[PDB]
Amino acid sequence: VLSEGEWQLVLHVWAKVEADVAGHGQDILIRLFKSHPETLEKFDRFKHLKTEAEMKASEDLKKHGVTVLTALGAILKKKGHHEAELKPLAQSHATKHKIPIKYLEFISEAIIHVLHSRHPGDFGADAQGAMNKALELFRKDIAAKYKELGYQG
Ligand code: HEM
Numbered sequence: 001v002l003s004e005g006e007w008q009l010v011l012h013v014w015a016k017v018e019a020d021v022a023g024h025g026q027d028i029l030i031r032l033f034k035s036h037p038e039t040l041e042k043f044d045r046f047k048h049l050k051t052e053a054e055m056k057a058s059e060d061l062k063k064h065g066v067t068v069l070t071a072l073g074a075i076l077k078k079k080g081h082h083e084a085e086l087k088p089l090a091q092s093h094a095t096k097h098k099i100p101i102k103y104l105e106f107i108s109e110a111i112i113h114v115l116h117s118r119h120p121g122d123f124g125a126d127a128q129g130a131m132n133k134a135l136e137l138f139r140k141d142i143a144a145k146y147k148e149l150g151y152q153g
Helices: 002-018 022-036 054-057 059-076 082-094 101-118 125-151
Strands: none
Touching: 002 059, 002 101, 002 125, 022 054, 022 059, 022 101, 059 082, 059 125, 082 125, 101 125
């Protein structure tokens, strides 16, 4: 479990992300797609995008980035008490979108990379540690729902 001091580090930097949800969302998805090209293939919506400039130009991609970060923000602000928010998400990603747990690991790495680019002074080691712990908790709780439904994998 995160301590109260660790949750404060997470939510302090998240308040900055919320100044520019769309810019953040875009950078994160693009990092994910470039670092792990196999993740782009999950999105019939975005499959057609081949270069980073094309990705950067796509309004639809920027719109989905907002969706992802708004859902994640609502989970983080529940500070671990996220059962009602997490269950729908784990059900669609396991059974409808077919997203392996590993790809949730990849997008966590992307989020940490982008927070680090954009918010150095608010994202030193102690905040990066707290953010990694929060994202592991998210993954751990999702993985348990996957297992229940027969998708641990
Ligand atoms: C931080 C983790 C993530 C969050 C908060 C998140 C959130 C969402 C939300 C809220 C939706 C729309 C509602 C729903 O279908 O559940 C969605 C759809 C989707 N997500 Fe995720 N997602 C995450 C990670 C991923 C990753 C890593 C992949 C793919 C590698 C993925 C693939 C999809 C797909 C394919 C859709 C449907 C897109 C469309 O055709 O409209 N998601 N996600």
